[PDB]
Amino acid sequence: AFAHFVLIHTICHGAWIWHKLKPLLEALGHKVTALDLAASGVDPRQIEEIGSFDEYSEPLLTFLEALPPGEKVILVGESCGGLNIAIAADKYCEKIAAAVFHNSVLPDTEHCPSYVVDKLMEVFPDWKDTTYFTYTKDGKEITGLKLGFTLLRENLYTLCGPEEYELAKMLTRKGSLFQNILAKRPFFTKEGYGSIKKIYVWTDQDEIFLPEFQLWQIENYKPDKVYKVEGGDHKLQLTKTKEIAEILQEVADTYN
Amino acid sequence: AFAHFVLIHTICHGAWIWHKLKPLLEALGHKVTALDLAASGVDPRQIEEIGSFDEYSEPLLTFLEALPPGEKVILVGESCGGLNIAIAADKYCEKIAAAVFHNSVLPDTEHCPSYVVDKLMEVFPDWKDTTYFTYTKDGKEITGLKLGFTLLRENLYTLCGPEEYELAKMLTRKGSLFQNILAKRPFFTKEGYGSIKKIYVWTDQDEIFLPEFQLWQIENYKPDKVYKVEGGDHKLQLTKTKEIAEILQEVADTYN
């Protein structure tokens, strides 16, 4: 079967991270939409203009709003993209056939929205050469960050070639986890986000979202299905593109 | 010998086009700077804020200005980048060891700055699915454009793989040739731009900067050296990356 996949990049990244996976999925006959979230990729906004993870998710929400009645999509989020999925699901659950998490945070409905992010910071506290700054938006102090090049090289693009790593150094932008904003955000709902089918994809060779963290997430909020990809790194859509496409095809053949 | 190469992308593109060549040059021991020109790549400005090719060249001029006395660089410009080179050379000729043109326009000093662009439009009048728009800046009506995806696929990235082509569809932005502005711009000088060493690199398999045009440019303004790369396409830094690096190494060993 064919599906319409909506690929969602992580913070400090953009649609470009999916440049290898998108054409492969299309070669299988699928429709693919790779969005640039707010102040990401070539989006015209700067991070200082964004005050929450919800605002950051605007392009995704706007896209879903534009889907004609009856049309459903399979959301695929990497790393922090799981949060955009949760936000989107609480507004357009009926338009989501399923959500695939790609070495991604997996929010739940029993704890605050920042719950898994707080846990992530405990498991991976040292972001190496990453730099930080603060800005104010809507009366709140937000911590912005720019991923360090060493962190990118050693923990995120561990096995990616020099040409993919180069794209990251050239294209990654300042962003934010909006951690303190998520902490005060209303909980994700059981009726919306809680109702969608969730497929968790990961590799135990991820050098940032460590096994301890991902296995902790799986136990915390049981996914409907779990796929473990052998080898690769945090950026499976670059290092195990074929494997990811195969998994997504099976998801398309399972949920609609 | 080692040199400091400053790679200059063409309109509607960004530093990202050099993601394959940059690491290869560094692997040879060179220092490489790949800039995003105004309203290009991840630059925060939008094209409607730019009123001339000179303004568009701001990041390059600012970079050269920051070079300490005595430090020289080898400029490498692709496609329309030759115009940024001419503009830069008339302000910082002493900081330029040489300029390499990569399937690029080659301005001269005998005719108006838009001369070769006007000729290009005669040789390649049909830009296929490219779209156009107009905006006003500093009292002048400027024609903006967004490269069509079919034009990108068939004429610019003719032999590039689907993954490189995908990056182009995701990252190319609205831009402008500022043709009418160039037409009224003071001529490039013989003392500045005219004095720099110019190396012309091209392939007769370029599907947009056709042989008729490139050979016309070579006859119009004699380069100091000409390198013809066999095969490849308009984006030699992607399809003949190794060959381009070899040529640049020889240039580094020839001019300083």
Ligand SMILES: CC(C)[C@](C)(O)C#N
């Ligand atoms: C490093 C991690 C938090 C990110 C930016 O989401 C990725 N990849």
Ligand SMILES: CC(C)[C@](C)(O)C#N
């Ligand atoms: C199509 C051509 C004018 C451009 C944008 O410079 C390239 N490549």
